[PDB]
């Protein structure tokens, strides 16, 4: 609001928690040997 950085911090937090919720059930802990990661855990 006042210093205009809370608008920046607040919005990327809200979308960031949505992204973190998606990232939580991604089994990306194991490392792959490939050009790109084809592993995407789609719940539904």
């Amino acid at each position: 609001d006042d210093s205009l950085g809370f608008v920046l911090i607040g919005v990327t937090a809200v979308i960031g928690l949505a992204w973190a919720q998606w990232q939580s059930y991604q089994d990306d802990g194991d490392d792959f040997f490939d050009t790109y990661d084809s592993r995407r855990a789609a719940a539904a």
Binding site: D1, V7, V11, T12, S38, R39, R40
Partner: protein
């Protein structure tokens, strides 16, 4: 107006964060030649 500046700032940051976190959401996997 300061309120218009606030609304434009949060809309711009919202769309930019949508772009940024969307491209971080395993974008190279979203291709038709994905190895199952």
């Amino acid at each position: 107006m300061f309120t218009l500046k606030i609304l434009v700032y949060t809309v711009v940051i919202f769309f930019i964060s949508l772009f940024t976190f969307g491209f971080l959401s395993s974008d190279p996997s979203r291709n038709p030649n994905r190895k199952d």
